[PDB]
Amino acid sequence: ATYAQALQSVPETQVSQLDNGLRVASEQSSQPTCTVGVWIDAGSRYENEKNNGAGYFVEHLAFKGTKNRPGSALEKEVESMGAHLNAYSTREHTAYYIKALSKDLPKAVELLADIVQNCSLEDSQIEKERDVILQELQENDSSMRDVVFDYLHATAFQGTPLAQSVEGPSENVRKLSRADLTEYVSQHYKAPRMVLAAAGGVEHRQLLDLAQKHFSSLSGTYVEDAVPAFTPCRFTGSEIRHRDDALPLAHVAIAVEGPGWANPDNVPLQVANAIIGHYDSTYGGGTHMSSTLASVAATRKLCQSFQTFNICYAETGLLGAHFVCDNMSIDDMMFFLQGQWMRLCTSATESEVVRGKNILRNALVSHLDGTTPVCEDIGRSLLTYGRRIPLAEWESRIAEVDASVVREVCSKYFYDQCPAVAGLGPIEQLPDYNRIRSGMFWLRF
Amino acid sequence: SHTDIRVPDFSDYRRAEVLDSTKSSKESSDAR
Amino acid sequence: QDLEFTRLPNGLVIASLENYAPASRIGLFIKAGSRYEDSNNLGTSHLLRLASSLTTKGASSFKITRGIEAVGGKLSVTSTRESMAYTVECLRDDIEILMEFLLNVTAAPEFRRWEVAALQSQLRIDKAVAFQNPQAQVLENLHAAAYRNALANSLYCPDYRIGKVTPDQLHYYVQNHFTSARMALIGLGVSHPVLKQVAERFLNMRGGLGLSGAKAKYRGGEIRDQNGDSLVHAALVAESAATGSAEANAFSVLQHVLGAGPHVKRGSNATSSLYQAVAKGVHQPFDVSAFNASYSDSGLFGIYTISQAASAGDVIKSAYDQVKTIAQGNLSNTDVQAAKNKLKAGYLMSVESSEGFLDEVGSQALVAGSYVQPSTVLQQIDSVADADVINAAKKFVSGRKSMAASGNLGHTPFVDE
Amino acid sequence: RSFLCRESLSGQAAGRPLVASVGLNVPASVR
Amino acid sequence: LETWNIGVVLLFTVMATAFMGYVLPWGQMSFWGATVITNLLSAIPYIGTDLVEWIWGGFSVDKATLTRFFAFHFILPFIITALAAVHLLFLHETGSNNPTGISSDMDKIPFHPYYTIKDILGALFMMLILLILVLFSPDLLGDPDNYTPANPLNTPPHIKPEWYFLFAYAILRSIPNKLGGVLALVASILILILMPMLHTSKQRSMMFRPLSQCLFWMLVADLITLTWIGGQPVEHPFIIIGQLASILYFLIILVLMPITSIIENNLLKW
Amino acid sequence: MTNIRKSHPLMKIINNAFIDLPAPSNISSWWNFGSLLGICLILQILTGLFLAMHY
Amino acid sequence: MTNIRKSHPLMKIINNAFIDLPAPSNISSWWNFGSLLGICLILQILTGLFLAMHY
Amino acid sequence: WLEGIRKWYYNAAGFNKLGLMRDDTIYEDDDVKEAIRRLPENLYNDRVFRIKRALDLTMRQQILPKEQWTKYEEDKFYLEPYLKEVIRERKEREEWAK
Amino acid sequence: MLSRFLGPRYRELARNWIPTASMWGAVGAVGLVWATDWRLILDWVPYINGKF
Ligand code: HEM
Ligand code: HEM
Ligand code: HEM
């Protein structure tokens, strides 16, 4: 049973669609557990400056109380059958998923229907929840990677809804009344923009009939006329530096415009990203890792941890790197990291491209291990691509990637493109934006 | 507090083409 | 499409399952760890865990790193206080190369002097990074204050041994605790015959049961350290049973009756009796959870608590009183059913991931030596009655205690009260 | 991370013995 | 490598400066040696002729060339000083090499109390030699015909350059092909650039390499032979001796030394 | 409070050049020619000047 | 492995004196003259030399 | 035979007169420098002292008495295994980069 | 030396940098012809040859 044989044997992703529009998608297997969740297309992108932070508030109040389950009773039902209920809200998607046994499927779907629909939104709990978010804002302020990435988004997509943080400024969260949230729920928690996903010991017919008998009350209209449209977001190459010398370590994230969820150029670029690799001070590979940047960093003890990212939204993305290093390394990595990118833009050997392809295949096949990652994959893919990409298709697209393709796509996205630097901490040594932009092009090429 | 960090408007200094919510940074990158 | 559990004459147990998954993981679980560390070789296990890439006999460090990376596989050495689990994952068409790599690393190392001297700094780096989470310090001091020896030894090299672990210590540890009898070879995504071939080809050099470690004795002391953190991390435990007994399952059920780990994100733990009991009382940010640790010969059971510095004395007290109520027969059968359901779900849900299943099979092979399907585990869990939980609570309450704390201990009570 | 809320603090307690893990291309982890 | 290459550049600059300086006093030797040496650049293909007319500032070494060489001889030594400073910088980045050829980082002594006085003694000895030369026999290393006003309509019986150039001039005379002669003239100095590459011996110095020691002294004797050959006119048997010496110089540097080092390592188990 | 020998910029350069520069112990006489070159250069720069003053 | 601009000895001096030298960001045009003088010096050294070849 | 020529060469080389061993006279390139770093402490200390004594003798332009000359038979080969391993590792790196 | 630089991926890098190096050489050739004012070549370019 070779790799290829296993790929065309992975269960399918049967997809259905009720009349209201809610797309039901399941993925049967043999495990006695399951993971059923609803992936809505809410997020900070669909939020104006007046109500930014509504999605976070709604996610907070989702599990608090319902009309049918008054409150803690919902938590009691979730805990009595051993299910773990979770929710994650991002800049584009917001989802609720219950991790429960296969036998508890009829009850779990009912619980998700109650949350996404008959949410109480009691004013007393709103007031209680108002402080919690404020505390969580300070906690996130302590999370230096998160604040650096929020700086990245703010300075890259400036003047666009994407620049808005998911949690929202700590002024909107102090005025968000019940009225603002109710419009968010009635305007974004709609059936067409919803995917009921499940994976594990789930039967697609069972999921379809449970959806028909529970989520039928979901509405597809948009009240009077208001249909929140998709606003394309401009990427304005800029920089932001919040220099705080008290911070022990300096975080710098630099990213250029990457593609959207469409534009198969993601597959080559990811391979290119895999060639750059990722490093942490506790790796153990040392001065032997195949990635040139990782080997240099380990040899000279340059950084504490650098990671390459390919954050991808519907029409644009932030493709680049983020590294954590001391005060007297920030410039040096700016030399090497950029020096790495241009190498892939001018001379990418087939050997390292094969290595990147293998790394990408491993990442994809490993990330889809376990019911919860599979459910997340289904819910995210149905919203981004409109269909779950089978692993065989991923394998084919990876196979079509070679050295010339990587060079072309990198030169198309990396070469001579203004970056979106964002730095925090003792970032004095961080090269000036003109120096970074100059480093974005090579005088040999 | 990091969520309260909003970039000031640069529309005064911004260059002609890149002045809107339209993408204008990929297709007009070559021009500028 | 099933799990074979062959055992060799040497003692190696080869377990293999062909799930026809796109990827494959091979794990070598050795019954070696901190508990098998005498007073002179402390920290050797930590260095051995860190020395997963040093130059072996037939594969240099450069070749090992490059070969594992070209396939894009991963090589982890997950370790506990009683077992060290080497693990390698990659695509099923390439598993043989990294199987050879893993077998060279685990059965024929060289431990060159310069490379070990280089790894000495990684020892400290890893210890600091792992200790950035307060739970690490408290959980380590808990064993240090509970067990006289054996399990008391830390997973991390003590500060005075950083820079002193000689290669001779590593060689002694390998050819004393890596013998065939105390190892298990588990494979997910691979066929049994090839696993048997690689086993009898490489792991057969080392035979016997190896140097057996000593038993664990319950000292029942305190290790309290003050480190300025506003949050106090207290942990009060008592000698529970050892895994593989009905008492162990009773203690496990008691853990979920008391409540351990949230189930609803940003929830309130309605069913958790500890959280509800403490809530009546301190109106401040806190957390309290039952804590069960099951080892080969002994085990611990108690309460772990994160609280504000001033209110800690209440949280340790009130939560403790809650267990007292359970000891006096205040456990309704409904809570027993809820705890059994939570425990069954938690077990079935930890074998969900392929890595989780691999670790479960490795632990079963190392400790018991025979695979048990989840149905039998659930049957054993259901065999637990209320009287067994009520005992377990009696054993916890009416036994010598062991407290480990952290943070500003101005108001944290001592074990005597 | 700094924790100053019940909801954020929830789950930070420990109920299973400490288990360390290091890798070759994966950062160190603990549980 | 850096210090050695900078040294080669310094050698070229010093040789050019000395050539121009000897042109300055406008003797018979001066004028005629300048004409003979500059006329080599006519051998360069294509541009060569133009180049000569460029450097001559006209059609022959004349009024223009004298002042031009004066200005160049004035400016060049300061460039030599700058290059010497760069040379000392590069050498200090690594430290000097002892006669044994082995790193001496353990037995290092401060420069001031010891090598300043050693260098003072060296300067005293060199001043002794130079002052003997100037005070007792000044026109020993020169040529008497240089004490005659330059007359372009008559040449001296012999046209020889200064002594420190004859070693190369003989090489020039070896090859009848004029362009080949100029190329060998340049290569005779540029060989020092390739010299670091040709090093094949496991050891660094020649302290423990007797075979290479005999080879090195063969090279020194060969250079002395070329210097002697340069002075004598182009007649039997100086022509054949000059060809043999010129061949042997490159044979020793390029072939005999690396092969000797290769045999050398084999003679010592490595 | 410090040596102006090893703190003043020019004096620091001179010190690292030929005052406290670590030199090999067993340097033979053949190395003296290094300085014997520089001194010659200085002399050549000196006398040539006084020649260009009447040439 | 390392940038030549900040590892090569001569290039290190050039970098620390003309490339990565931290200069104030608000120096007016009056600070340009320090450059011009130097350039003028070069020009004076240059043209004068070409004057020395026919004077 | 050949070994007689090799012994004659060892005698005529001269590094025996200084108390030096064969490996002390080797040029210190990057491979040799890394090999020297890799040496065990007890060998490294003797290497450093032998080198320093030799430099002292050459500074005073002297040699040890004939009795304290490293004999050809007694000329051990301490740096050879470490240098061989270092060269092997470098060759592996170059072949992988190929 | 040359043993190390003779490789599959080394020739592949050479091939990658062939266009840039070749047309850098073209840059040099055009600059040399221009600065030198090489009449032999400049007599064939249409507009420029009118200068002579
Ligand atoms: C302008 C004339 C020169 C001056 C002023 C000069 C200056 C110096 C000085 C002062 C030293 C240190 C003393 C010494 O080791 O000898 C030195 C070292 C050196 N010079 Fe020169 N030098 C000149 C020409 C050359 C030439 C022509 C070469 C060869 C191409 C050269 C190559 C070296 C080398 C290799 C060293 C290091 C010697 C060692 O480490 O043992 N130099 N130079
Ligand atoms: C690099 C060091 C120098 C060398 C090797 C050098 C060499 C020479 C030589 C060989 C001559 C011809 C001597 C003769 O007539 O027989 C000469 C002449 C001359 N040099 Fe220099 N020179 C040097 C530096 C300088 C400098 C720096 C100057 C200007 C300050 C200078 C000015 C002159 C003048 C004016 C003459 C003509 C006077 C005469 O020839 O006697 N020289 N030089
Ligand atoms: C510090 C920079 C310099 C200054 C300020 C300077 C200034 C002058 C001035 C004012 C004159 C008179 C020009 C005239 O009246 O026509 C002059 C003439 C001359 N300078 Fe300079 N000079 C400098 C550098 C040099 C250098 C480096 C050289 C030699 C390479 C040189 C060679 C001459 C010569 C040969 C003349 C006479 C020809 C003439 O008068 O134009 N100068 N210089």
Residue numbers in the entry:
A (entry chain 3N): 2 to 446
B (entry chain 3R): 79 to 110
C (entry chain 3O): 22 to 438
D (entry chain 3V): 47 to 77
E (entry chain 3C): 110 to 379
F (entry chain 3C), G (entry chain 3P): 1 to 55
H (entry chain 3F): 24 to 121
I (entry chain 3X): 1 to 52
The study reports:
A key group of these are the respiratory chain supercomplexes (SCs); these which primarily consist of complexes I, III2 and IV (CI, CIII2 and CIV) in varying stoichiometries, which serve as the minimal functional units for NADH:O2 oxidoreduction. Here we report in situ structures of porcine respiratory SCs, determined directly through imaging porcine mitochondria by single-particle analysis combined with cryo-electron tomography (cryo-ET). Our structures, with an average resolution of approximately 2.5 Å and local resolution up to 1.8 Å in the best regions, enable in-depth study of mitochondrial respiratory SCs in their native states. Our in situ structures also capture numerous reactive intermediates within these respiratory supercomplexes, shedding light on the dynamic processes of the ubiquinone/ubiquinol exchange mechanism in complex I and the Q-cycle in complex III.
CIII2 transfers electrons from ubiquinol to cytochrome c (cyt c) and contributes to the proton gradient for ATP synthesis. Comprising three core subunits (cyt b, cyt c1 and the Rieske iron–sulfur protein (ISP)) along with eight auxiliary subunits, each CIII hosts four metal centres (haems bH and bL in cyt b, the [2Fe–2S] cluster in ISP and haem c1 in cyt c1) and two Q sites: Qi for Q reduction and Qo for QH2 oxidation. In addition to the apo form, we resolved four distinct Q-bound states. In state I, the Q10 headgroup is situated near the [2Fe–2S] cluster at a distance of 10.8 Å, with the Rieske domain exclusively adopting the b position. In states II, III and IV, Q10 takes on the prevalent conformation revealed in our cryo-EM maps, while the Rieske domain undergoes a stepwise movement from the b position towards the c position, eventually making contact with cyt c1 for electron transfer in state IV. To further analyse the detailed conformational changes among these states, we measured two characteristic distances, one from [2Fe–2S] to Q10 and the other to haem c1. Our results indicate a possible sequential progression from state I to state IV, characterized by increasing [2Fe–2S]–Q10 distances and decreasing [2Fe–2S]–haem c1 distances. On the basis of these observations, we propose a model that outlines the coupling between ISP movement and Q-binding states.
